[PDB]
Amino acid sequence: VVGGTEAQRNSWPSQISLQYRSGSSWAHTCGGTLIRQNWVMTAAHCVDRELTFRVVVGEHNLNQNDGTEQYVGVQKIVVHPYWNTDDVAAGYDIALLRLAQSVTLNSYVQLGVLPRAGTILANNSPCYITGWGLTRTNGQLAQTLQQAYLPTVDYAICSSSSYWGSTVKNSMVCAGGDGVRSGCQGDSGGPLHCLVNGQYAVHGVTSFVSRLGCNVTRKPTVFTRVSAYISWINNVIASN
């Protein structure tokens, strides 16, 4: 997250760190949202690699002992069947991870609330992106969980020529684009929390940013629209 601030450690309890085994240790690679005690929602591209992934809930500082972490392996990965790694612009950048065990819920570990199917936010709706992604384009991952205020940019505006053009689909949510704040590498798969009717809900799964940079003006961060996959999510969880 570029232009973010450090999140309080109990503000976004559904946020998780998706990590892969890199030798005698683990490296953070993407974010995710805990949606069931044993299911995590993330981006399909985060798991394109044939790596050994694990999920950390109750995580706040990737480099220090927060004393609230729970480490659990990924037992099964279910990527959306229409996902195509060489075509992120087509959408379908979402996947569900079944954890090897159910995590214990507390003030640092809670299920993320998803929006009602079909919900579309009005332009400029209040949201916060969270994650440990790069704090600057071509920078380094954050140590502490970061959050940045990224208001939505509706489809009509986001798909206009000065923005993303036809790259963005109605199955996506765009947020930010002020050239100062944005998601960045390492934030993918994480949540886009939007305040609706007094409650925050995870409306997006971080998918991509411009190839020219993270915080590029008129190139808002793009997320997979969660409300367009409610049935898919339910069907997968009901199956596995």
Q: Per the annotation, does 50 bind a ligand?
A: no
* The one catalytic residue among 14, 17, 45, 182: 45
Q: Which residue's entry shows tokens 């003030």? A: 107
Contact 96, 80 (CB under 8 A): no
Find how far residue 88's CA is from the centre of its chain: 15
Task: Give catalytic status of residue 93 as yes or no.
Answer: yes
Solving technique: X-ray
Three-class SS of residue 144? strand
Tell me the CATH number for domain 13-111+228-240.
2.40.10.10
Q: Give per-residue burial for 154-173: e unless 16+ CB within 10 Å, then b.
A: bbebbbeeebbeebbbebbb
CA distance 95 to 82: 11
Contact 206, 232 (CB under 8 A): no
φ/ψ (deg, to 5) at 219: -135, 65
E-assigned strand segments in the chain: 5-6, 15-21, 26-36, 39-42, 53-57, 70-79, 95-99, 127-131, 146-149, 152-153, 172-175, 191-196, 199-208, 221-225
Tokens of 160: 């206009």
Alpha-carbon dihedral angle through residues 60, 128, 223, 119, given to the nearest 10 degrees: 120
Task: Give catalytic status of residue 87 as yes or no.
Answer: no
Contact 145, 6 (CB under 8 A): yes
CA distance 134 to 80: 26
Contact 100, 77 (CB under 8 A): no
Output DSSP code: residue 34: E
* The one catalytic residue among 125, 182, 188, 210: 188
Domain boundaries, the chain: 1-12+112-227, 13-111+228-240
Q: Per the annotation, does 143 bind a ligand?
A: no
E-assigned strand segments in 59-123: 70-79, 95-99
**Is 13-111+228-240 in the same CATH topology as 1-12+112-227?**
yes
Q: Per the annotation, does 59 bind a ligand?
A: yes
- What kind of fold does domain 1-12+112-227 have according to CATH? Thrombin, subunit H (2.40.10)
- Could you tell me which residues come within 8 angstroms of residue 23 by beta carbon, excluding any fewer than 6 positions away? none
CA distance 169 to 171: 5
Q: Per the annotation, does 37 bind a ligand?
A: no
Point out residues after which the chain has a gap (C–N over 2.5 Å). none
CA distance 19 to 40: 13
Q: Which residue's entry shows tokens 């944005």? A: 182
Give this entry's resolution in angstroms: 1.3
CA distance 219 to 176: 8
Q: Which long-range contacts (CB under 8 A, 24 or more apart) does 207-213 make?
A: 207/43, 207/45, 207/88, 207/93, 207/172, 208/88, 208/93, 209/182, 209/183, 209/184, 209/185, 213/137
* The one catalytic residue among 17, 80, 93, 210: 93
Measured from the Cβ of residue 137, the count of other Cβ atoms closer than 10 Å reads 16
- Could you tell me which residues come within 8 angstroms of residue 225 by beta carbon, excluding any fewer than 6 positions away? 120, 170, 171, 172, 173, 203, 204
